[PDB]
Amino acid sequence: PPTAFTPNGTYLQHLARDPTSGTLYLGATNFLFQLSPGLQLEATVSTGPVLDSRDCLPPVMPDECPQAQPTNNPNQLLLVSPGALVVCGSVHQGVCEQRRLGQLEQLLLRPERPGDTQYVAANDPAVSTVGLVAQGLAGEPLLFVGRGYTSRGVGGGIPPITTRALWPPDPQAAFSYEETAKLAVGRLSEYSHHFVSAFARGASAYFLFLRRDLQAQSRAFRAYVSRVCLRDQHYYSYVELPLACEGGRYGLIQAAAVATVAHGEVLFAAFSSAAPPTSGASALCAFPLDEVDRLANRTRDACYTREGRAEDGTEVAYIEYDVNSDCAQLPVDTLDAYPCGSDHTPSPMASRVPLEATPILEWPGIQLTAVAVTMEDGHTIAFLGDSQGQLHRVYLGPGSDGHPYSTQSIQQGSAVSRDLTFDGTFEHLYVMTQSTLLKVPVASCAQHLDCASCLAHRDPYCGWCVLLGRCSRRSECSRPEQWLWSFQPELGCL
């Protein structure tokens, strides 16, 4: 019976894990929870309901907002920074606050009179907000925010990607962005950015998102990964790469994870063939971050020094979003001197060449909504959640077709959140639907005390250590002694 947290009278939205302590933070409707690694409740903070209107500006009080009605507050963004928990709700134009780590109840910073540059998150629960935290070139913490388009109420003018200050000189300016700390993009309602994930590696921040390809008469949504330098607060280095899972046949990216050969990080992302109704199939596609960086680097080098062309002459780079910019023919010393650009280099760059992947696996009738990937004995294992509330486990090593070896219902009819995360040791996985959070062990080998039940509950982690009389992992079969893999059906007990 797995450990669970099922809060009554609320729905869940986001899960954030502190990598230094393991403490879990749970964003819910009108609630924030602080949980131990074993899902014990350490604090409960009420965030709503509040008086609000999407046509009113915070702080919302009756005199200046006569149309205000009581409004519930689904969490829109939940992120651990080195010194604080960043929290942005759906109410009050998506304004944010900072709370103390390990004492959620204590507020650290909440601007008293926030202005137009401090409306961070989408004010609509159905529009996603993604974020990531990073240290900036002045030593201070930065918050990258990808925010989708909102139509209803003031706040359709917020830039789709922004870089905001978490601890600026004046605390009251917290969460605001400088004038150039944004992706300057018009026709926001037409592109209609839908953000799926944001992550960092090395000196780069990455965004995964959907947006309309306005150069196609279909005006159809396409999946993109964009890279921007992680610390400068500028978008000079922004480069946009289209993603192609089976040529774009699986077009609507849903969820992703990064997993770890040096700098061998790979992005695993799930893609749906069909959009949700106003049938279909899902695929898992792998994009090694080194390949992501080479294409981004090649896009930049072509735009900077070869008028957007590769060394063979091919047009590979161009300027997006109808910005008055063009690629250039700068001296080649530019590439080592300004890897992240300047306020005069061509921007915002995009690649004509999509990043392509052949699906790891293709499942009909399943809409994958969550991805987490780990390794065991050098071989990839994927944990995948779907729109019906099921968690699937898939061995991706030699001998597999990509079909899951285990499928369990977390909650029937409630999609698994893309906020799937492992614990520090990769021994447990935290899985969340709209109403429940579970701590799931990645393997339960020890539960089997005879060889037959060990080998019968087929699991890539589990095998019978002969000279130990235990169902264990291969790493645990040593005092490397004989280990009967439960994932070798042609091999049985002795």
Binding site: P125, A126, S128, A275, Q367, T369, S387, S414, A415
Partner: peptide, 15 residues
């Protein structure tokens, strides 16, 4: 909701 819904998690949870 809206026809702007491309996420199946969003559809499951809010539509």
């Amino acid at each position: 909701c809206n026809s702007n819904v491309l996420s199946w998690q969003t559809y499951s949870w809010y539509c």
